[model samples]
Target chain A: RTEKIICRDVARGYENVPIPCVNGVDGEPCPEDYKYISENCETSTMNIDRNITHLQHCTCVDDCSSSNCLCGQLSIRCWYDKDGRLLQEFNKIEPPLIFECNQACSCWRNCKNRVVQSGIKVRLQLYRTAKMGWGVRALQTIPQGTFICEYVGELISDAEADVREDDSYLFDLDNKDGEVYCIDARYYGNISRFINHLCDPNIIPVRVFMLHQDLRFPRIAFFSSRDIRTGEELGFDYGDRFWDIKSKYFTCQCGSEKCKHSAEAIALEQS
Target chain B: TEKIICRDVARGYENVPIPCVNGVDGEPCPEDYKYISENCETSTMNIDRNITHLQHCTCVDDCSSSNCLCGQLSIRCWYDKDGRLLQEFNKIEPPLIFECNQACSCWRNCKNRVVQSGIKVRLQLYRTAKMGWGVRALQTIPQGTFICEYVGELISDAEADVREDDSYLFDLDNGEVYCIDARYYGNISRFINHLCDPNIIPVRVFMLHQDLRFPRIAFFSSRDIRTGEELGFDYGDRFWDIKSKYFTCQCGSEKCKHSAEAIALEQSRL
Candidate 1:
């Protein structure tokens, strides 16, 4: 059966760390509110049109050389360089850049433009921290501008955002000037959801819009801001907008050289 | 990492194994057809009604007995017994609640069954600034709350082809009656309009009346919608053909991608 099942034992394959099925002796368990699912499965919370993301197919004889390629004609390019290295070109001032090749495209599965669809080839690990509940670490050194993972979750309205009344697991999309949309992973998400926040982080979030051109609910992805060493913990700034409010409830435990002490904590000062 | 942002999203429900129910004549709907429930695996509801559906029944006694089915279980009440639903409905443990049916021994007051009971919340109609007329909720509606059924006169596929007026027709597929005309004798649901970001969704339900020609259709909130929030649902891609020439949707939603006629045409090509 294709039905997803909970993997309590250490997660094999991909060398990725397994999410703790239960509370360990040292670190607290993953949030009780967020159920554990091995894969990233987001169900849209809104009654949005399911077909809005419908994509067209194209047939090509060679490596999609012609401008006739549906994706290429639409200004879609691979997110990698000729040397098979990921290229980092984040332009926050402009709209997010994203182009994906659908099943309709005649390009081979190994097409360079098929970056996000190619799936993760890196090894990641999940381990407990002194302060943070669970943290993700790379098994090997990663080059700068490497695409890590996408923050996937259910899409909810700003109205429900207020109803949630909590700062945890809510990522708001900067939709230019449209209806507010946020991703809530309290109940469903991936390893990206477990990554904690740091004032001085090596990972950086970049906005990317794909499939439907609608900007309200673009995909949120992460790329290494700088070359990271082996066994290094992965983190990114949660933005001052989020830290500003949540800091009041918890303290930052990320013991970096530039720790701002403005985030949720694992425990308090002892006697 | 190749950076695949896609992952399998959980529907906020328990991953319980479901038993399959064989269809009529032992020729099931193939393993691919996602059946709503095991009992509903086959063609159990009305076959002629444009929009027909039903519920399930594993009763202990005759369907008329009030002690059987959900009727008795609903009376066994609560972890939060105040009778007020405070937790999110869609996020409930199972995300689905099976109601009682005519084949089950449950009362019409089967506390376990609410969808079959009919409209329980307050609602109203207010004029929309751009979309002409639409429906509005007068009270705070929690997510997953059952709204109303889109009931109307069922029309045959042959009859639908000959009808001149195309507005307000809901097509029920699978060799059934084909369409339901909600224009004249429609319930409050007829007043409901379309939205790019809708708060409600049409849900098909099955029941004790597993008769192949008559099932029930209902609506439920997709998320926690507040008072005055206009209810809506995605009209699907089929409506794009007729919607282009006749209507200009005034949903006013920031994600209204299909507003312009040209954009509608381009999207329909998909």
Candidate 2:
């Protein structure tokens, strides 16, 4: 249930708002401005909303637009899509799940105080040359394994996340603590905007530890597929797990130096 | 049916007529402008090409336009003022399909299992997962956008005899139709490892083209791709065989589908 921490404490417009803490700084509850957003699971979609507090679950208003979420608040609010559940939707949960936590190795950063309140635009600065789904043109160079940016949004409860999986493809990733957390990894936009896939990826997915006191969450991260050049599309190796044992209805075309060829994760010894 | 050009057919700014050389047989045409003008057209003369020469019709203000032909029909890509791309006389062609063997061996090797191909370690990555990174998308794929067309070989009961392990059979529009060969050495969907299990749909959908020939079959997702997430498709219940082949899914999904039951049950909730 332990997760790494990435950002918290700032309000909309990225301002610091003192909040209720669990006494000591370590394992302390994020400021009162933040409430836990939940129900996000392996299969769901979400966007950023500044309207929310770091952990405060917003039920009074509707984000309607991404701008609405940014309407200055009291803390750094992370927006998340709904939970990956089938029945949860029927339960009156505001569709979106609890804010999934992104724990960082350093819950404590060397950055200046109240800096957590500063919302740095962690963005993928890459673009596509044309639109036919191909390329590695990154808009900028991201340091290898440098918390390029957390696939930040939110998390859902196990039950809700389970049902939501059918709506969208969400996956439960492993937390450094061995917990399975769901994430809306496949992006129709923003998330993987400039990253292209390698039949054989040079990068590997690793656990991105986000530091959260009230909740535990895990985000997907990838090790460098190679020394990437600016404008190159970022990518990661989705481990083989299906297809092989079942059917080849869908084949992978990554054609990379270390391509797994298909969707099924074949054990190295067997391959 | 010849050129179903808008100017030649009904209403304002209508669509191009679907040139069906033979006239009758197969698929739907929403509000077609089938031209019996030139000669009945076949599948070859259709699609992503210019049809000005072969089939001539009344002057084209009502006729000239971009066209698309599939096994169903060939419709033109319609447009509105400002030349913005509008819906086709029919619908959009499937936007995604694997290029067989792009040296990536997507077709040859059916699973995303790691098979070191290149000499450099930098390029080393799991095959299927290689296409989708964990986070950063290498390209700017739009959401709701149909990213890739999932194309594959289908086997009918009579024609699917060559391979020993080919075990999928679909009861598509009719009859006993076998599915794409996905056995390790035979199929395609068998590669998408247990990585993800959401954001997908399956359709026995055919293109809206008026033509009766344009790579028609079942396809998955006609939308955009997220940067690092894995790509997946739903194999209609037609792909599972409870008595024979079981659905041993490993897509790393929390709702991992079990195939021990009947195909109906396997594909029910998902």
Candidate 3:
């Protein structure tokens, strides 16, 4: 039997890497855009880095205290309440969500407030789902308020994004300071790209302003909304617009009681 | 469920999500196609092969204008050198030469049947800082090496137009009537984005089977290309003029001229 030929190109950083399998079409090798990274994620023109911002940093000593915090001076403070419940207002509205330790801050890397900058601290696996294509599963129980992984990809403008086929991978970010940008993970993204959308989701996407405070494009990191058990599938609500576009094209098999049936059920009813 | 094997490129980063046609992740692709190594085989794709269209060619040497069997006349009918193609070019402007198909008595090594032998050069799919994803040559691709064939679902003029979300489409004729849509089931060529000033150009070539309805489209290097440079071609004015369908061109060419303002100026002058 005649075997197929191979086109040896470059070393794709997959050996022993924790990224796991990139299984897909025969002969379709993964492009460089599909790698997992802690920073500098991109799509054609936009680069999404959780640690980067346009605002200046505050100088601190040991901890990021309010007196010396630059972002704090600009009204960018950590959103956690006394009990660690993320201030509901930060998650509810779009603008008051800027919180990040800046270069001028004297806070250590372990500052309890600087969670997203540390990258993925939890172990995750790319699990093949029963119906929703590929999904991400936690290896162990994750506590609520704990940062899991940052939803990173190409930071693109509305123009470039509009030209692309919106295949359920664009994440909208608002700095509340009035900058609106989107993160697209279709070609390049982290494990968060695989987290399917669900109405009753265990995780929530929180916008944190850690490094710079430009008032536009805040860092979007995922935190456990509640105590999730080991091997539980991770998910989040992809908003009404995403649901409206996706539901019309694909059936909602998210296996949740609150499944919107199709993404368009709400939009269809309103129209 | 179609099982796919993910492999990695040797020069770049990350494991490839899909298997090369041979099933292996990448490189030393099957003799017939230029995908990563794997046992899987199919038609009109994976470095391009369809068993139905497969013809047997045995000519040990390259197919020549004199020795070729698919109507070897002193004058090739469809194309003239640098003027018009023998057949399709004669009707409208065309690119590349029509070669003998597998059915001819000529050998596989025949120079006339370049596109049928599959991609013989090293091509890589890289992410551009601004162009999103693009195709590039992994090594020094000479001016005339058989690069690769553009394979996609052959759709009609009306069908291509009806698609609400359409990109990566190719015009089959010099006129805007014939079309090839590589949207869903396409080879690496789908990643070849659009550019006004491009390093590669698409040319029309014929196979030994002599199917006038379907001529194979092949790409050739317009100039000596560097290893890391991106590959692209012109998408034409019709694609840009579509109302409410404009994207900012970021090809980064010096003295480049693909802006909407420049397009409007050209249109006004016309």
Clashes of each: 25, 157, 71
Which DockQ value does candidate 1 get?
A: 0.02
User: Which tens-of-lDDT digit does each residue in A111-209 have in candidate 3?
Assistant: 535556556666666655667776777878887766777787666666666778755788877434445677777765656777887778888887766
Best-to-worst order by TM-score is: 1, 3, 2
Error of 2 at B203 (Å): 53
lDDT of 2 by residue, A209-232 (tens): 222322245344333434456645
> Can you tell me the DockQ of model 2?
0.01
Lowest summed lDDT across 10 adjacent residues in model 3 chain B is found at B36-45
In the range B1-270, model 2's lDDT, one tens digit per residue, is: 422221211111112211111123232222212111111111112232211111222221322233211111223322233222233322243332211111110122221111111110111112332222111223434333332222333344454455565433323333323333323111122323222344433333322221212333332233445554454555433443332254454444555554334335746866
Ranking of predictions according to lDDT: 3, 1, 2
- Cα error of candidate 3 at position A1, Å: 30
lDDT of 3: 0.55
- lDDT by residue (B106-147, candidate 3, tens digit) is 433344545555665676655555656567776786554456
Kindly provide the TM-score of model 2 when superposed on the true structure, using C-alpha atoms.
0.26
lDDT of 1 at A102: 46
